[PDB]
Design a protein around this ligand. Structure first.
Ligand SMILES: [Zn+2]
Ligand SMILES: [Zn+2]
Ligand SMILES: [Zn+2]
Ligand SMILES: [Zn+2]
Lengths: 185, 185, 185, 185, 185, 185, 185, 185
């Protein structure tokens, strides 16, 4: 089952974390982790600050790097370098309503591509992505070349966006404390 | 083939059985069991009463529990706890006309989800479901929390309904002796 | 797991059954069925008499034939013609102490052969056999030719015996009521 | 590849063969055999007359039976009883223009069903069918019960028709010498 | 690879933990967890006390039960009921020197059995075991019957011991604070 | 992943190479090789001239033949005869803009066929093809018969075209130095 | 099963056949073909003379070549070039007593090698070999280089001999009419 | 086949190459590359000097790093970070007589371990190793910790040595020009 083949990954922030703010009593990042854990057996967090907090919830923490690369791609590569699965489902810390069929729908719609990411009907969410580790070398080469754009990389790897326009407000992102108040229950 | 990979399960009733009433000379529950047995090699019955009757037809009977949980979910979990397959096709005792392509269509339309159930064009039949045992832990947690709603659970697991609107009257349910008379041949 | 890939088969007798006699309160044939059911999910009985008794224990009964062939091979072929698995573990009704690792050891020692049977250190037990359905055509041809010898057939199919000389008295066969008394507890 | 997993079967006639008549210098049945052999490695002929002729082309001949059942289903069952593959692609002797993508399209459109057959846009061709051997037991039971209708059986097994309406005149059947003249090149 | 197919499990104690005592600066239970984590991606702890301590190391904690069963078997069953893998490698908290090839050797020596445990040359260690979840139903039945003996259960499931007599002092168990002093570096 | 299962093949020319001309500083053939290498681990070049140039880029060169057959099919067959994979993705040297999802889309759209090629919305590109080695024998027979037409062969093998009409100008072919100037950046 | 994965091949002679002489009423080559057909579904003959005779038994005939190479290796390569399986079991026409477990024992003893051949206790029989088609390219290169020695090639490919010293007189070869008389029954 | 699943790797030297010296007219490193290429489809070279020379033979060159780690382990990790296979067979540049069954024997003797290396009867050759990429994270952690010992790492990963004591002088290493003269033909 996908549950035992894809490693879930909370992208908590590369070199505070707004993901620590509570939504309905639970920190934003833990909404994401809990949603991934309902669908996937093995779930880790990519974090470079507050490691003890993430770890304290029973999750393994993967710290970045080797080289101090910038942005989300750097965390993705760090996780592939430090974890053995074939497949990873990444999600940032601030999208607490991700749907219960995230992994299944992304996988079903992959069309044999090594990477896919969510399009919510309005925009792309390239860091909510199902990634095969076969693109580890390409990612390393991309970052070594000084490149940083997420979607450009994912397209260059042969990926595409998957339509989640029917999953209402599942991909809302909590940008600030103020937005968080529009969502408190 | 699906025939040898999915265990069929007649949900005969958790803690008489109207499924014992005869439709065209054959008990309602045996219509269901026979339909499952045409499509699947290994088929069992979840029953907590009249166990000897079900067993007498050559079917293994799984009794509920561990804990006295309520409703169909309790029987589903009981069956996963007591049977070793990866996949189960559950069906209640009172839907005698289930189609010969039930398992194939549910599986084909799963879209990589760990659970799917029938929608007949008019309504959901959440207890006519193809279930991967990976959701055993989630089900246990759900029931331990005091929750009982079937479709809510199946959605939370990442499942969805599968359209059988073209399978005419295949999902009629015999609620009472009176309805049973509308169907006698 | 082997549990969900091999169909167990009690060879109860082709055209009373001494296998109906009780050993320590349980009929000989049910000792065998219970031993197979501990190791295998799906288990059936090949019987041509007392079908209701076997069936009443929750086991599907396969009756012989098509053609009225003689002996155990006839039952084996009948079962392959009427059951869909790839693999079958046959055992006669009168060997109640068959070991809990029967299927695993036979499979482990197959050496890529399509059939293997037990040798107990003293003699062959060719009807205690793990059989791939690929030899269905060969068996049919053998029986159509008027041949009946079990071990000859199994050798001709490319099979061999597997040493169970360390499984003490596991393959005792209860030939008569008198032998049964040497074993009563 | 499908080429090495599906056994092709020319249904040449159960208990002359009009399939022996030549179309553009090649016997109708050999048009079918050649089309199957382009797509599939292992191809056999079900024949009960002129066995030497079919065999002489390098094809193994499977004769019917065990029991003298009627019609095409009888040949299908005979072939499953005498051949070891999981999958069979049957075709009658008189449809010489069957397409080069017959096996691929039938398989692609199976929708997890154990049997599928061709619909040419105007009618069903239930004997041009892709069949999983899991339905061997059901077929045996059907024929033993005295039933003979092909499509009824295939529906009861959970099968469906596959649209080949775009494959122009690929499913023309040569009923008589006269029709054969409408096709001579 | 085995790394991504077998779930590691530290058996930390069912209803203080001596496994909390430090050996060379690291708690005994964490020696075990670290050894399992070198070989396996996903590793959990079965604990019913000090849950926060185990969880704080980044490990998911599985608490016992459903029913208050006794002993290690109860923890094994609890873990299978609450975790989705096919395979589990259990180890108690007080065997800190378990070898780096534990999972590979147990798996290699399984001989198609659904469970295997370590024999160190002097004695059995039945709670250092590689277990297929197919024996979940058997375990449940065993415990419901009031049975508790570990090795008896594992033999009844078809398992056997695997020789680790060449892995010197790898299976030393720290019974008390005094034994722990014989090992301090 | 497809990356490690399909061998990429640059069809550089059977018995100068215009593919040696530079587009934006990189030879046309190396545009193709680089595009294939982003998607596939193992990539080779079919060349019969300038072998040292192709080889110098780190690519293995496969020279034609056995028999001096004509055209692209000859190179395809040469490559299947000299390389061990199951699957090959061929592309000529003069289509430098082939898309990053070439292999994934061709594979996803194969519909169980052993060969597929690109249609760009305006025309077929039968030498941009995903080919299963099962058609090696058919290809050999075709060429031995004196036949040379690419698309005819691919249709006869059971293949079809795959729509890439949405991949803008990805299949432009540089026919001459003059066309190459319309594309210089 | 091996029956449906390995193609049997009678090596009948490259550019009369003593294999046509009758042993106990059946031609030597047909003893071999029949032995292969008991173990394997799909069996072909490599022949360059008397093609009609071999074909007349229902076997497909593969004629040599492309290039007029010498010896048994030439026939092996011809067969791999013209047949789609992954695995081939070759045997010459004059070893009529080959054992019923030939394919299983060769496969079991392969030790992950791409080719294995029989050693009968006294000598090697390098043309009684189980061959993976991955060595097709190596074979082509070997023959193109002007090399002909069978065992040298098989060793260079990474193969080894498999001990059949316990299969008494199974590998007797009938060199002449005179030897054939020592064997007539 | 192993040929298409394991990537061969010549370890040519991390930050002249004595591997450039000719043995019987062929550079030592090319003896190794050629031996790997006979057994494996895809073979690369890890080199940090003379990259153009290695590349010129048709081999892809992987340069070290990310971080400037020391020794052979650094090259192994570099290759896993930059190549997508599951399995790698590493060999240094100066062991020109490596046997034709290197990959098969190492794989056959792995005993489910993620890494194995050659023991020649006299000593270990830990850089002649079959490595699963699952140990990429462990290797990274090991090197980041400042550790460099090869065999220690391979043991810590759960590996073991494989006996090649019967492969005479296959593992001779050419240390110097003088040793090279003891071997010139
Ligand atoms: Zn059953
Ligand atoms: Zn985990
Ligand atoms: Zn065949
Ligand atoms: Zn390569």
């Amino acid at each position: 089952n996908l549950m035992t083949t894809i490693t879930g990954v909370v992208l908590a922030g590369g070199k505070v974390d707004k993901g620590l703010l509570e939504l309905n009593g639970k920190p934003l990042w833990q909404h994401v982790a809990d949603a991934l854990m309902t669908q996937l057996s093995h779930v880790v967090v990519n974090a470079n600050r507050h490691q003890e907090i993430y770890q304290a919830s029973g999750l393994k923490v993967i710290e970045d790097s080797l080289a101090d690369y910038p942005g989300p791609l750097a965390g993705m590569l760090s996780v592939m370098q430090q974890e053995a699965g074939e497949w990873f489902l990444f999600c940032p810390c601030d999208t607490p309503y991700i749907p219960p069929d995230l992994a299944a729908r992304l996988n079903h719609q992959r069309k044999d591509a090594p990477v896919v990411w969510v399009h919510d009907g309005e925009r792309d969410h390239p860091t909510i992505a199902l990634v095969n580790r076969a693109i580890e070398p390409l990612l390393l080469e991309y970052l070594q070349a000084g490149e940083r754009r997420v979607m450009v990389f994912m397209r260059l790897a042969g990926g595409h966006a998957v339509d989640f326009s029917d999953h209402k407000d599942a991909f809302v992102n909590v940008n600030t404390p103020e937005e968080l108040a529009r969502w408190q229950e």
